Design a protein around this ligand. Structure first.
Ligand SMILES: *C(=O)c1c(CO)cnc(C)c1O
Ligand SMILES: Cc1ncc(CO)c(C=O)c1O
Lengths: 287, 287
């Protein structure tokens, strides 16, 4: 009884980012992924250049009508969206979630509010952030912002774990039942490691792993993998703790392989056996 | 060094066919796949209906210009083409193959001349067939036609295994060094078995496996998976016999899992472990 996820995000022909980074790892974990690509780019934006195009918003709507047309929309367990090529796609993606839920009221909407962080190298189109803030957030059942996005969504700064657990709950209040702060940064207990947070209304778990020295060029996609894998674990019945721990270790595995190979692109394929069964163990802490 | 394959063929959001059928198994076997999708369809054409779009020919070329721009083309080890959305995509693909070859002279063009049966089978645009006999064939280093495609490519009927090895070699005289007759059908020893042929100027190998009964609804993508895995096997050093034995066993596992699950869509994900490590053994015969 495999889980089916309609993942609506970017696709790069060369390299990994969005669906190009998330799809394979998710399938290696035994889940089905229906990749509805939002763009088809030659490579990701951190290169400072890339060719390709943005799928028109109406194309995305037309794709799902086709899936409904063959009577399969009801088999979808979740809709995950991530990097959008334009703000107008957002609106159609919400119509999609509405249709998916009409066909399956248990389907969940997983919103990874990928906003543009030009300094880190991620280029996102204008209007996309406002979309997450005013429409995406309220419509989501699960949301996964990094620290910056958290601030943009709750509309105020966050400077520690306590404030993060609080800010997350401000979002939960607006709709999502689960919040994944996929990168605490300065707001974590230690800024010398990688920290994440998985918060619900009644509970909150903390996890961390070591930062991997990549210098002036961190590999794109860590957060897309993290989001993809988390949705997969939860849909499969993993507890909040189990989900967080497996996901943290698997990503670290991809991390070390990528660095060992002296590669800039996340090595999701080479590290595949350790995504399924990672060898490193990282402990979560219930706050 | 992990092998890199630029695969130019279809993408379906729901289901498996083209890159959506071949990509996962290829990566599962440890190769990288750069998927340059020739279309983004809701499902495969054999449902009798679908939505989505064809990528414009120029789109295929600009994507590759993009990969060249970041200086990565030279890492491409092979260009694989399969289902094309239009006849003009073919021309651009041959431009792509020359570009990849100028950057990496050892790179190979693998042509799976999908011509379809636009009536009772696979729905392919008019003129694609013509592109294959005219250009695909002579530009290709490896070509994998099924029985109908072979007859069309050599311009004559083929009625048994020996005429097939013969027709394959008439193609080799036109350009490729390797021919995979991906399904012998009526031209094999028996129609009660799935047969294939891997042929070169000096040798030829025949292999068979049991048929898997799906009634009237025959799963799509078996040929796409077979070609991709053969390319991966060959690029990573397998002998003709090794390549053929592994690909035949692996595809068979996918088929038995598809049947056991009573699925119409090739279960390339459910059977992933038996793709890398098949539990069935099929012996190839050197003619
Ligand atoms: C044939 O149904 C088909 C192929 C051939 O495997 C590849 N892509 C698509 C979309 C279709 O329909
Ligand atoms: C194309 C593309 N898609 C997704 C992301 C990050 O989720 C990036 C980050 O740079 C990107 O460039």
């Amino acid at each position: 009884m495999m889980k089916n996820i309609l993942a609506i995000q970017s696709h790069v022909v060369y390299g990994h980012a969005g669906n190009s980074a998330a799809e394979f790892p998710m399938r290696r974990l035994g889940a089905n992924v229906w990749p509805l690509n939002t763009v088809q780019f030659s490579n990701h934006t951190q290169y400072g250049k890339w060719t390709g195009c943005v799928m028109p918003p109406s194309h995305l709507t037309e794709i799902v009508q086709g899936i409904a047309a063959i009577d399969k929309l009801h088999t979808c367990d979740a809709v995950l969206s991530g990097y959008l090529g334009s703000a107008e796609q957002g609106e159609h993606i919400l119509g999609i979630v509405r249709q998916v839920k009409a066909a399956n009221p248990q389907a969940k909407y997983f919103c990874d509010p990928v906003m543009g962080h030009p300094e880190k190298g991620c280029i996102v189109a204008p209007g996309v952030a406002e979309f997450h803030v005013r429409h995406g957030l309220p419509a989501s059942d699960i949301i996964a912002p990094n620290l910056v996005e958290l601030e943009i969504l709750c509309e105020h700064a966050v400077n520690n774990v306590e404030e993060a657990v609080l800010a997350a709950r401000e979002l939960i209040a607006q709709g999502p039942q689960i919040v994944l702060v996929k990168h605490l940064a300065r707001a974590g207990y230690s800024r010398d490691r990688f920290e994440m947070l998985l918060v619900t209304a009644d509970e909150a778990w903390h996890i961390s792993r070591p930062l991997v020295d990549f210098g002036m060029r961190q590999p794109v996609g860590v957060g897309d993998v993290t989001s993809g894998l988390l949705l997969v674990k939860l849909l499969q019945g993993a507890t909040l703790q189990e989900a967080l721990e497996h996901v943290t270790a698997a990503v670290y595995e991809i991390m070390v392989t990528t660095k060992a190979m002296q590669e800039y692109e996340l090595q999701v394929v080479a590290a595949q056996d350790r995504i399924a069964k990672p060898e490193h163990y990282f402990s979560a802490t219930k706050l």
